[PDB]
Design a binder for this molecule. Structure first.
Ligand SMILES: CCCCCCCCCCCCCCCC(=O)OC[C@H](O)CO
Ligand SMILES: [Zn+2]
Ligand SMILES: [Zn+2]
Lengths: 277, 100
């Protein structure tokens, strides 16, 4: 865990004739959510979603709410411009998603700053790693790029990403240190369920781990079985941990040929597991 | 616009063992656009007290949501998650498989 990250993920969805577009933002530090804003809430404001954010004072929340409302207005204008660029109907609903944030290196340096958008689920424009140039997906985004070059948007983001972004992330990492600077290793086990009297499903479990990144692979005599492995998406426990499993269906007499390999930041050594009857 | 069908997992927070309070989770992920309907079902009946996470999304911009509720399993009851989305024919029901 030399690198830690902060991300804001915003989703703006137009609903023409059915009100102004809906705007939702969530903030994460690594794999832990810490804030939200929902434009459809009773009193829309940035709110804490981690107990270690409840010690910020009201002026912090006021500033965060103002920034989010300002961004929301820009995104509503952007949805209108994009519909026109693509010659789309005024009646349809469309989605603008944005991601921003920073990766903080172990020495305190900016490893990477991000600002990128997708339109209707496809990459649209992205701040390049140099925080001074842009990558545009098509001519629509090349037009956005020119308007942003004219307004010095890259330099506004570079200032934030190299400064306040990292300072805020540092503060969160200290305030929520006991949650965020932990590496909870997975509790692992292998189960065995016959599927006929000649074959069995071996399932390798990883439970209760944090952060979410993990590798779980079945090997047969050292050979990767990824093509014959059912591997579910890593999923949240709901308690700040994650879960995953992978399974293979094998001939009963070959069961001891199979090993499950688990790698996770919280593990001293990568794990090699087998069905233990 | 890109349309991606939701993946659906229904599972408990902790290993299920009957008479012990636990959490019933339905994780729906990989979908686009963001509008979706999700219910947790006890014996085919819609459950109350079901909360959900704030809308977020993955690196490929697909959305994910956790729906969850307190519950206490036992031998009799069956649970399931029911999801509807514009990529589906109609509401899809996935039963909770409690012995994997
Ligand atoms: C993907 C979200 C990106 C923003 C959309 C919703 C606001 C989210 C709350 C604040 C996040 C950091 C944004 C605020 C950082 C900031 O104030 O500076 C910006 C640049 O300086 C351009 O002006
Ligand atoms: Zn004030
Ligand atoms: Zn067997």
């Amino acid at each position: 865990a030399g690198s830690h990250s902060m991300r804001y993920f915003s989703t703006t969805v137009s609903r023409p004739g059915r009100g102004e577009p809906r705007f939702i933002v969530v903030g994460y530090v690594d794999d832990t959510q810490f804030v939200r804003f929902d434009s459809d809430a009773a009193s829309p404001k940035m709110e804490p979603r981690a107990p270690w954010m409840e010690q910020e004072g009201p002026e912090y929340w006021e500033e965060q709410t103002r920034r989010v409302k300002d961004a929301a207005q820009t995104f509503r204008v952007s949805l209108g411009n994009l519909r026109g660029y693509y010659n789309q109907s005024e009646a349809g609903s469309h989605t603008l998603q944005t991601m921003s944030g920073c990766d903080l290196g172990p020495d305190g340096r900016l490893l990477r700053g991000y600002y990128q958008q997708a339109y209707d689920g496809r990459d649209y424009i992205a701040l390049n790693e140099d925080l001074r140039s842009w990558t545009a997906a098509d001519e629509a985004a090349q037009n956005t790029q020119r308007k942003w070059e004219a307004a010095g948007v890259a330099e506004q983001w570079r200032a934030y990403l190299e400064g306040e972004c990292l300072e805020s992330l540092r503060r969160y990492l200290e305030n929520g240190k006991e949650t965020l600077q932990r590496a909870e290793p997975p509790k692992t086990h292998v189960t065995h369920h016959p599927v006929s009297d000649h074959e069995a499903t071996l399932r390798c479990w990883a439970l209760g781990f944090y952060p979410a990144e993990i590798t779980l692979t079945w090997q047969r005599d050292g050979e990767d079985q990824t093509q014959d492995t059912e591997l579910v998406e890593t999923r949240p426990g709901g308690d700040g941990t994650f879960q995953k499993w992978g399974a293979v269906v094998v001939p009963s007499g070959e069961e001891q040929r199979y090993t499950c390999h688990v790698q996770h930041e919280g593990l001293p050594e990568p794990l090699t597991l087998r069905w233990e009857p | 616009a890109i349309q991606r069908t939701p993946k659906i997992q229904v599972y408990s927070r902790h290993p299920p063992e009957n008479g012990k309070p636990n959490f019933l989770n339905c994780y729906v992920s990989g979908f686009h656009p963001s509008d979706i309907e999700v219910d947790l079902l006890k014996n085919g009946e819609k459950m109350g007290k079901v909360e959900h996470s704030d809308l977020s999304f993955s690196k490929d911009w697909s959305f994910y949501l956790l729906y969850y509720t307190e519950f206490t399993p036992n031998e009799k009851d069956e649970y399931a998650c029911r999801v509807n989305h514009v990529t589906l024919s109609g509401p899809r029901t996935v039963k909770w498989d409690r012995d994997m």
